[PDB]
Design an enzyme around this catalytic site. Structure first.
Site, PDB file in Angstrom:
ATOM      1  N   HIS B  67       0.841  -1.199   0.000  1.00 52.62           N
ATOM      2  CA  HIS B  67       0.000   0.000   0.000  1.00 52.62           C
ATOM      3  C   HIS B  67       0.877   1.250   0.000  1.00 52.62           C
ATOM      4  O   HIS B  67       2.101   1.120  -0.065  1.00 52.62           O
ATOM      5  CB  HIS B  67      -1.049   0.013   1.141  1.00 52.62           C
ATOM      6  CG  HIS B  67      -0.426  -0.135   2.479  1.00 52.62           C
ATOM      7  ND1 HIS B  67       0.128  -1.316   2.907  1.00 52.62           N
ATOM      8  CD2 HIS B  67      -0.169   0.782   3.433  1.00 52.62           C
ATOM      9  CE1 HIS B  67       0.684  -1.116   4.094  1.00 52.62           C
ATOM     10  NE2 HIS B  67       0.514   0.181   4.434  1.00 52.62           N
ATOM     11  N   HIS B  69       1.898   3.706   2.031  1.00 56.64           N
ATOM     12  CA  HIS B  69       2.742   4.275   3.075  1.00 56.64           C
ATOM     13  C   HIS B  69       4.209   4.419   2.659  1.00 56.64           C
ATOM     14  O   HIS B  69       4.746   3.581   1.949  1.00 56.64           O
ATOM     15  CB  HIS B  69       2.589   3.485   4.369  1.00 56.64           C
ATOM     16  CG  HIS B  69       1.451   3.900   5.241  1.00 56.64           C
ATOM     17  ND1 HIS B  69       0.892   3.064   6.182  1.00 56.64           N
ATOM     18  CD2 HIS B  69       0.747   5.050   5.311  1.00 56.64           C
ATOM     19  CE1 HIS B  69      -0.126   3.678   6.749  1.00 56.64           C
ATOM     20  NE2 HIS B  69      -0.270   4.881   6.201  1.00 56.64           N
ATOM     21  N   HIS B  72       6.446   1.208   3.283  1.00 57.55           N
ATOM     22  CA  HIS B  72       6.337   0.080   2.374  1.00 57.55           C
ATOM     23  C   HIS B  72       6.763   0.481   0.953  1.00 57.55           C
ATOM     24  O   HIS B  72       7.784   0.021   0.470  1.00 57.55           O
ATOM     25  CB  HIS B  72       4.928  -0.539   2.515  1.00 57.55           C
ATOM     26  CG  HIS B  72       4.653  -1.011   3.901  1.00 57.55           C
ATOM     27  ND1 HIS B  72       5.358  -2.055   4.448  1.00 57.55           N
ATOM     28  CD2 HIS B  72       3.796  -0.599   4.852  1.00 57.55           C
ATOM     29  CE1 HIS B  72       4.963  -2.241   5.692  1.00 57.55           C
ATOM     30  NE2 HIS B  72       4.011  -1.365   5.965  1.00 57.55           N
ATOM     31  N   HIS B 154      -7.029  -1.484   7.249  1.00 59.13           N
ATOM     32  CA  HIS B 154      -5.889  -0.566   7.534  1.00 59.13           C
ATOM     33  C   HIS B 154      -6.072   0.778   6.813  1.00 59.13           C
ATOM     34  O   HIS B 154      -6.255   1.796   7.508  1.00 59.13           O
ATOM     35  CB  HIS B 154      -4.565  -1.259   7.191  1.00 59.13           C
ATOM     36  CG  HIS B 154      -3.360  -0.384   7.279  1.00 59.13           C
ATOM     37  ND1 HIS B 154      -2.714  -0.135   8.474  1.00 59.13           N
ATOM     38  CD2 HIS B 154      -2.664   0.271   6.327  1.00 59.13           C
ATOM     39  CE1 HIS B 154      -1.682   0.653   8.256  1.00 59.13           C
ATOM     40  NE2 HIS B 154      -1.629   0.915   6.945  1.00 59.13           N
ATOM     41  N   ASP B 175       0.477  -4.682   7.577  1.00 55.81           N
ATOM     42  CA  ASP B 175      -0.453  -3.625   7.884  1.00 55.81           C
ATOM     43  C   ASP B 175      -1.893  -4.112   7.681  1.00 55.81           C
ATOM     44  O   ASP B 175      -2.660  -3.504   6.938  1.00 55.81           O
ATOM     45  CB  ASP B 175      -0.067  -2.362   7.104  1.00 55.81           C
ATOM     46  CG  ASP B 175       1.149  -1.596   7.612  1.00 55.81           C
ATOM     47  OD1 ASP B 175       1.582  -1.856   8.726  1.00 55.81           O
ATOM     48  OD2 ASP B 175       1.644  -0.733   6.890  1.00 55.81           O
ATOM     49  N   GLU B 200       2.663  -8.676  10.238  1.00 57.06           N
ATOM     50  CA  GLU B 200       3.084  -7.491  10.961  1.00 57.06           C
ATOM     51  C   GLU B 200       2.968  -7.786  12.459  1.00 57.06           C
ATOM     52  O   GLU B 200       1.935  -8.296  12.917  1.00 57.06           O
ATOM     53  CB  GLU B 200       2.116  -6.365  10.607  1.00 57.06           C
ATOM     54  CG  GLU B 200       0.749  -6.535  11.279  1.00 57.06           C
ATOM     55  CD  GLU B 200      -0.349  -5.505  11.061  1.00 57.06           C
ATOM     56  OE1 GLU B 200      -0.026  -4.402  10.610  1.00 57.06           O
ATOM     57  OE2 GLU B 200      -1.531  -5.810  11.349  1.00 57.06           O
ATOM     58  N   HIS B 411       8.298  -6.734  11.067  1.00 57.62           N
ATOM     59  CA  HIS B 411       7.664  -5.430  11.264  1.00 57.62           C
ATOM     60  C   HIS B 411       7.041  -5.290  12.668  1.00 57.62           C
ATOM     61  O   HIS B 411       5.842  -5.076  12.844  1.00 57.62           O
ATOM     62  CB  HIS B 411       6.726  -5.162  10.075  1.00 57.62           C
ATOM     63  CG  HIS B 411       6.102  -3.807  10.015  1.00 57.62           C
ATOM     64  ND1 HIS B 411       5.003  -3.464  10.771  1.00 57.62           N
ATOM     65  CD2 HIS B 411       6.379  -2.729   9.252  1.00 57.62           C
ATOM     66  CE1 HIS B 411       4.659  -2.218  10.517  1.00 57.62           C
ATOM     67  NE2 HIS B 411       5.490  -1.743   9.596  1.00 57.62           N
ATOM     68  N   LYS B 459     -13.422 -45.086  -8.781  1.00 61.19           N
ATOM     69  CA  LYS B 459     -14.785 -45.443  -8.434  1.00 61.19           C
ATOM     70  C   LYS B 459     -14.800 -46.747  -7.640  1.00 61.19           C
ATOM     71  O   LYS B 459     -15.466 -46.831  -6.587  1.00 61.19           O
ATOM     72  CB  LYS B 459     -15.622 -45.530  -9.712  1.00 61.19           C
ATOM     73  CG  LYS B 459     -17.105 -45.807  -9.548  1.00 61.19           C
ATOM     74  CD  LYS B 459     -17.872 -45.284 -10.789  1.00 61.19           C
ATOM     75  CE  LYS B 459     -19.387 -45.378 -10.718  1.00 61.19           C
ATOM     76  NZ  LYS B 459     -20.054 -44.432 -11.646  1.00 61.19           N
TER      77      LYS B 459
END
Lengths: 526, 498, 298
Positions: B67, B69, B72, B154, B175, B200, B411, B459
């Site tokens: 994402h 941030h 990251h 998040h 996250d 995380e 993390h 079978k």
């Protein structure tokens, strides 16, 4: 594999696939030509309807419940919608229902609340909501006026034989039902689980189904049903190029053992682009002379494509101050979705609309069927003026049925039908490449269209089986080999004992025991 | 059949989240970050793998970014030209839209601080090499490997990614918040049974209700400040964090309403307003429904605040811009609020940004700036964990739903992680790691071999099963192309020996 | 008109012609004495017809005729049973079993019901037929006594398909609702399948756990399970809580109603409750307060 075909119309198919010990109802559709068959129902009592005569069917019996308009019979009951036959296969045994397009998913709530069925419908997020506001729109229109008290009383075979042509040609008469309530709508939408595109949603650890992108209007989701050996692909509402919506995934539909193609152009001579252009010309011409314009359209798909062109023409023609008044309850919602993914929309007629009404305007109304909705009432007002025009943008309903009850109308009548759905040439080019071994598609496609002699019909090298109503057709596939994974810590070792016969062939004696957990196979030594 | 995971920037260190993952023959970098609070030596977590093969494309098959941030995706533009990466960088659609926004804004702050930083030119270059992957969409990046997004909560665009090449799945979950915070419901992963789960561990201590607790704390703090011109100085590092702060201010006004004064994030709060409205699909189900029927995120107060809150001694509720940076609007605001009774400052995020984080931790009155500036603070410092994240209870729950063969902790700080690791080891019957930066775990798995049976055979054996002891014979044909299991007789017939 | 119908059925040109005619006949209702007429005729046709499609509808028709108010399904249950023994495609057999269940419920006489039940135990053992198995479970459940039945159903508790698993749970659940008393064996079996992969199964499982919990609250579970011995109900309450925190939105709905409906939970455990984990989907949220108030009285 047996595919049961439960609905006649090419447009809405409802075809039930029994396969790998799991059965799937590939669509649930409400036809709506039956509704065009009944006499139109206005929001406010219309003089004509009250003063209409009977058709003098006589032969004893009914003079109450059959009327005559312009030498064509109608019925003085509420419009009743044809629905896919339920009898040939039990609904219970059809497990999950896949639903392709929001237009093609009507009649979901009929089945779920009427005839017993305990499974989970899978439909992609856009289509669910669009379909939700479309059925709500439909329910509102028929329940705005409570004239459903009356009974059709014409269904009898004997009655049908004697009566004239328009009614005579009903493929089923006895299966017609009055519209479902908002509760059933709710139940239906609740049971739908919202599944995104290319998502491998697997049912009961048997087959893997996934909604591919079709290219048609938002939420159009053709489906592939594969089992690691046989890929069956279902191809409805799968317009190639329609601009904004994500395009058709031909590559993902490639190398399919058995292709079912059902959605296809209602009009083969569609010429989409040309018709859009003509549409806008005609509208312009009439607003210039000062007569009004009426457009009968739905709340998604065609509506937005026609709006973008109108704006452009106004920019180019400087034909402003002509109110583009869209009148429908879910107009609010409709625009909201467009946002999420000079036109003034009014949920209520005789309200904001009445206060703001101006002498010339372009009004996009309730329903294309012309039986149930707001179109009916505006049609009546503007009928008696030559100036005022009506443009039918919608392919679903034939030009001539709407014209039929309202035949003595002054309005200039224009037909501008636009279908973005694959053309027959498009379907032909699609299917060369996709290269599927057997294809199942309705009789309609098999033969050339009744209207035109010309050989535009859908043909494949394998000479594909034609569907039909109440026709259970078995295609030529037996399952020959199925997967089974091998254990890690115990089995692999003992089952890694190959003894070479040929350069490229080996042989290993495998002894183990099989746990059949949640329909998956694992052999490991005891 | 060994999957090697080595966090170059994640692991024992929080921020610069970077985790290389070698499932089978395929290498996949899980993030690439800009650890903050350091002038140099942390722009990009050093790349061992880069030093080995000149071209990254050859060595690395693929890169998934979690994402927007700066933690990251912050150093994602590092990779445009200098170390010269090409390939499908895979983010969710909300991520990729906001990703350049934060990249460029940091780019702005860096140049006013010379530094051989990526220009907008090369950030754009790096962004042009990006593929958007929708939610729960299985996309084959290579012939063999494929990657599927999940909902991580998040922020809008938090994608939990499962890289699976064969039957062995490594599912990174970075996250992820396990509560329905505003703009986001709870993060769901299905029952994949992946071999390795990477999580995380920012919160290794179990916390109270995410929304109710954070409301109570906020209200109390605000009331406490309000006595004598109670100031607000709150750092906010994200677009969707600003919205959270705005909602909290709205709540304050609803409960109290004694003081009219309200302030907003920054000049361009128009933009955040815009972006949130745009992505209705991704937002919390309920919230989206509420938005389709109600107005969202009204704000017109920022402009009024700026002028009012220009070093004056009033009640204005200013959530300033990048709090934990070398310089910025936020630093200016903090300098303005410094040394007065009025002032109360809240650390809404994790407040872990190298030196600034350390200062926050010990809350020393005699704090020294990077430059030769003497600032002494006498405001009240309170931290609340209002930041969207999963508590150690939440980590347990998601481990539960995945139920992997093993887990790996990235993390968080080692102390916290250690306790969490112990807990997970005791609680579920799995062995879990807590590796440091540059340290690899060679977690052995074994190959799970897929072969096809004859349906007849299957079978028959199934029939044998149900009446009760179940030994099953028969041979494999092995061309290395189409491994098949056939019957004794059938195999004999196939090879033509009577 | 009975003998005309006879003639029409054989005169069918093709397999799918026959199919449609049967379908059309379905849509015209039949009186007490004509239902006897057509049943016989339709059985005769069934014998001589080689396509399954048509056999299947013949079976559906048979069921419809069984359900007729005037009609009493006697002298043709034996015929049905006979055809069951010598039939060959699983779909058709399942449909016939469904007809048999309809017949069973139509007349509440002890003898014939028991016969039907035995027949369906025989058909219960059917292999790689997900559907015969499910139909059989349903019928056992429906025609069942007041012990053997209960014992049987656990076998199919542990079955390959989740689809059979569910059916078994519902069947037991049904047996309860006709005034029977389930055993603590059933309780243990229900606790064993509360954490299956499939969502259906879990839904049903808690349903049952709640059922048996209300049946035996006073009884206790001796097994320590890492703690001192506590009440059956105590553990049931606990297991239902866990489900509130399970990874589905519909599994939680199952839990919420049952959690609220629980009684004579120990004051300790009842106080301790994590029913304040109401989140995400707002349907669940609203639902869980409803019963809270019903039982705050308590």
């Amino acid at each position: 594999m047996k595919l049961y075909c439960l609905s006649g119309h090419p447009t809405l198919p409802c075809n039930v696939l029994k396969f790998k010990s799991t059965t799937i109802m590939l669509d649930c559709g409400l036809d709506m030509t039956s509704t065009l068959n009944f006499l139109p129902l206005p929001l406010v009592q219309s003089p004509r309807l009250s003063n209409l005569p009977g058709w003098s069917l006589k032969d004893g019996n009914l003079d109450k419940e059959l009327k005559e308009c312009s030498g064509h019979v109608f019925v003085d009951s509420v419009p009743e919608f044809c629905l896919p036959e339920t009898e040939l296969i039990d609904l219970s045994t059809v497990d999950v229902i896949l639903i392709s397009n929001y237009h093609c998913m009507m009649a979901l709530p009929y089945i779920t609340e009427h005839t017993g069925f305990t499974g989970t419908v899978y439909a992609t997020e856009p289509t669910v909501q669009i379909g939700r506001l479309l059925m709500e729109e439909l329910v509102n229109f028929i329940e705005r006026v409570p004239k459903a008290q009356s009974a059709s009383l014409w269904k009898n075979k004997d009655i049908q034989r004697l009566l004239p042509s328009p009614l005579k040609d009903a493929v089923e008469v006895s299966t017609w039902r009055r519209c479902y309530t908002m509760q059933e709508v709710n139940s239906a939408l609740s049971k739908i689980q919202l599944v995104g595109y290319s998502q491998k949603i697997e049912l009961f650890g048997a087959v893997q189904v996934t909604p591919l992108s079709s290219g048609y209007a938002l939420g159009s989701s053709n489906w592939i049903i594969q089992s690691h050996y046989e890929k069956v692909s279902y191809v409805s509402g799968s317009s190639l190029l329609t601009t904004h919506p994500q395009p058709m995934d031909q590559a993902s539909l490639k190398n399919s053992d058995v292709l079912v193609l059902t959605g296809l152009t209602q009009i083969p001579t569609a010429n989409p682009d040309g018709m859009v252009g003509e549409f806008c010309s005609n509208l312009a011409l009439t607003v210039r002379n000062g007569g009004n314009v009426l457009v009968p359209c739905y709340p998604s798909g065609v509506i937005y494509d026609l709006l973008e062109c109108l704006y452009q023409y106004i920019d180019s023609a400087g034909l402003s101050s002509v109110p583009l008044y869209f009148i429908s309850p879910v107009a609010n919602s409709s625009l909201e979705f467009s946002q999420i993914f000079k036109l003034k929309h009014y949920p209520s007629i005789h309200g904001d609309f009445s206060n703001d009404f101006r002498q010339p305007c372009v009004v996009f109304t309730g329903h294309p069927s012309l039986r149930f909705g707001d179109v009916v009432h505006f049609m009546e007002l503007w009928g008696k003026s030559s100036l005022n025009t009506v443009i039918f943008t919608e392919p679903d309903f034939s030009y001539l049925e709407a014209l039929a009850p309202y035949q003595p109308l002054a309005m200039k009548c224009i037909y501008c039908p636009i279908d973005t759905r694959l053309n027959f040439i498009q379907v032909s080019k699609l299917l060369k490449e996709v290269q599927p071994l057997h294809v199942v598609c309705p009789e309609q496609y098999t033969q050339p269209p009744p209207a035109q002699s010309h050989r535009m019909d859908l043909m494949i090298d394998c000479q594909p089986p034609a569907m039909s109503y109440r026709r259970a057709e078995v295609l030529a596939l037996p399952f020959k080999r199925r997967y089974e994974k091998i254990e890690i810590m115990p089995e692999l070792a003992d089952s890694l004992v190959p003894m070479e016969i040929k350069p490229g062939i080996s042989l290993a004696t495998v002894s183990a025991v099989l746990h059949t957990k949640d329909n998956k196979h694992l052999l490991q030594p005891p | 059949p060994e999957i090697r995971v080595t966090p170059l920037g994640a692991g024992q260190d929080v921020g610069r989240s970077c985790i290389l993952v070698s499932i089978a023959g395929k290498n996949v970098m899980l993030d690439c970050g800009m650890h903050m609070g350091f002038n140099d030596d942390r722009r990009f977590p050093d790349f061992s793998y880069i030093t080995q093969n000149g071209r990254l494309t050859d060595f690395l098959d693929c890169v998934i970014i979690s994402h927007f941030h700066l933690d990251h995706c912050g150093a994602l533009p590092y990779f445009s030209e200098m170390v010269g990466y090409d390939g499908p960088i895979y983010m969710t659609h909300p991520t990729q839209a906001i990703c350049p926004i934060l990249l460029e804004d940091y780019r702005k702050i860096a140049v006013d601080k010379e530094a051989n930083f990526f220009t907008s030119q090369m950030i754009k270059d790096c962004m042009k090499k990006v593929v958007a992957v929708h939610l729960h969409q299985t996309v084959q990046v290579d012939d063999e490997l494929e990657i599927k997004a999940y909902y991580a909560g998040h922020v809008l665009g938090a994608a939990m990614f499962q890289i699976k090449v064969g039957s062995e799945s490594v599912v990174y979950t970075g996250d992820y918040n396990m509560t329905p915070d505003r703009h986001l419901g709870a993060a769901w992963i299905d029952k994949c049974r992946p071999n390795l789960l990477i999580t995380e561990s920012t919160y290794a201590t179990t916390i109270r209700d995410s929304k109710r607790c954070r409301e109570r704390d906020f209200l109390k703090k605000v009331h406490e400040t309000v006595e004598r011109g109670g100031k607000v100085l709150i750092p906010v590092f994200a677009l969707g964090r600003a919205q959270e702060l705005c909602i909290l201010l709205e709540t304050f006004w609803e409960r109290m309403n004694l003081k009219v004064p309200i302030y907003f994030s920054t000049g361009l709060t128009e933009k955040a307003n815009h972006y949130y409205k745009l992505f209705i699909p991704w937002t919390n189900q309920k919230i989206r429904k509420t938005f389709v029927q109600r107005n969202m995120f009204e704000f017109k107060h920022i402009k009024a605040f700026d002028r009012a809150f220009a070093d004056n001694p009033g009640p204005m509720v200013v959530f300033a811009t990048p709090g934990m940076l070398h310089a910025g609007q936020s630093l200016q605001i903090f300098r303005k609020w410094a040394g007065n009774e009025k002032n109360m400052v809240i650390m809404p995020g994790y407040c872990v940004q190298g030196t600034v984080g350390h200062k926050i931790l010990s809350g020393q009155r005699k704090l020294e700036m990077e430059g030769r500036q003497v600032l002494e603070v006498k405001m009240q410092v309170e931290y609340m964990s209002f930041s969207a994240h999963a508590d150690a209870k939440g980590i347990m729950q998601l481990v539960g739903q995945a139920e992997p063969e093993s887990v790996l902790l990235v993390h968080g700080e080692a102390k916290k992680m250690e306790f969490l690791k112990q807990k997970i080891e005791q609680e579920l019957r799995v062995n879990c790691y807590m590796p440091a930066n540059g340290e690899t775990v060679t977690l052995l798995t074994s190959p799970s071999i897929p072969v096809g049976i004859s349906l007849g055979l299957l079978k028959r054996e199934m029939a044998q099963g149900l009446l009760p002891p179940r030994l099953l014979h028969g041979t494999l044909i092995m061309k290395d192309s189409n491994f098949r299991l056939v019957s004794s007789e059938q195999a004999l017939k196939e090879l033509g020996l009577a | 008109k009975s003998a005309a119908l006879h003639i029409d059925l054989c005169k069918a040109t093709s397999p799918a012609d026959a199919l449609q005619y049967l379908l059309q006949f379905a849509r015209k209702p039949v009186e007490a004495e004509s239902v006897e007429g057509v049943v016989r005729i339709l059985l005769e046709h069934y014998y001589k017809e080689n396509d399954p499609s048509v056999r299947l509808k013949i079976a559906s028709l048979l069921g419809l005729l069984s359900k007729t108010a005037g009609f009493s399904p006697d002298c043709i249950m034996d015929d049905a049973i006979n055809i069951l023994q010598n039939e060959k495609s699983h779909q058709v057999l399942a449909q016939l079993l469904d007809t048999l269940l309809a017949i069973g419920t139509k007349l509440p006489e002890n003898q014939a019901i028991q016969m039907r039940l035995v027949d369906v135990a025989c058909k219960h053992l059917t292999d790689t037929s997900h559907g015969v198995r499910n139909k059989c479970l349903q019928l056992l459940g429906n025609l069942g006594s007041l012990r053997d039945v209960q014992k049987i159903i656990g076998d199919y508790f542990s079955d390959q398909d989740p689809r059979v698993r569910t059916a078994a749970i519902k069947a037991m659940l049904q047996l309860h609702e006709r005034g029977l008393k389930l055993h603590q064996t059933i309780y243990n079996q229900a606790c064993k399948l509360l954490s299956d992969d499939y969502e259906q199964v879990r839904s049903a499982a808690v349903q049952l756990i709640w059922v048996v919990s209300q049946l035996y609250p006073e009884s206790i579970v001796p097994i320590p399970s890492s703690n001192e011995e506590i009440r059956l109900v105590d553990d049931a309450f606990g297991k239902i809580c866990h489900m509130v925190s399970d990874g589905s939105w519909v599994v939680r709905v199952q839990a919420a109603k049952l959690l609220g409906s629980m009684e004579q939970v120990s004051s300790h455990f009842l106080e301790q409750t994590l029913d304040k984990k109401l989140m995400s989907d707002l349907r669940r949220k609203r639902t869980a307060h409803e019963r809270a108030k019903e039982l705050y009285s308590s």
